[PDB]
Write a protein that binds this ligand. Structure first.
Ligand SMILES: [Mn+3]
Ligand SMILES: [Mn+3]
Ligand SMILES: [Mn+3]
Length: 180
């Protein structure tokens, strides 16, 4: 990965007169990981995601899925139970998971992570999104039971974890993992 860049660097000669540094290499690896993330994200966008261009705010996805604007407003003041920082839905609705797909009142989210440690990367993304999305589902269902929306919603969160090295990817669905 960096072998290639070590060789290129050493051919720069007068235009890079210092030996390649560790800090440089770490930055360059980070740039490569960011591109890997974006390519895999584009792959999902090509033939899965409703959002073909960019990531979308959760509040906006709810609107696209038919949640009335007054319901979204009502939800904003609520605090997510068991959120690691006590985040409100007003803040949570601004967050932008990579991909979503709406099938009626089922809303699926897929977050891409590129990580050296798949288990860690999955845990990090779940910690970010999962309590909030679960809570949204619970609260929407209450509105349905009260007759204020005609159907409840199902909200799922999935993580696609792409290894930094090699072509192996781990998919975490809500109830199971598949390494690949
Ligand atoms: Mn140099
Ligand atoms: Mn993103
Ligand atoms: Mn991502």
């Amino acid at each position: 990965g960096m072998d290639k860049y070590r060789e290129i660097h050493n051919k720069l000669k007068e235009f890079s007169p210092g030996t390649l540094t560790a800090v440089e290499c770490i930055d360059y690896l980070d740039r490569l990981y960011a591109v890997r993330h974006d390519i895999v994200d584009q792959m999902i966008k090509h033939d899965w995601s409703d959002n073909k261009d960019s990531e979308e705010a959760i509040g906006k996805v709810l609107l696209f899925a038919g949640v009335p604007s007054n319901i979204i407003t009502a939800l904003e003041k609520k605090i997510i139970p068991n959120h690691p920082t006590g985040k409100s839905l007003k803040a949570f609705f601004k967050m932008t998971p990579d991909n979503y797909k709406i099938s009626g009142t089922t809303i699926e989210f897929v977050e891409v992570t590129v990580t050296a440690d798949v288990d860690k990367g999955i845990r990090e993304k779940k910690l970010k999104y999962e309590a909030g999305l679960t809570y949204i589902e619970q609260e929407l269902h209450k509105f349905f039971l009260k007759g204020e929306i005609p159907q409840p919603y199902k909200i799922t969160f999935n993580v696609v974890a792409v290894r930094t090295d090699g072509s192996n990817i781990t998919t975490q669905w809500p109830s199971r993992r598949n390494d690949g």
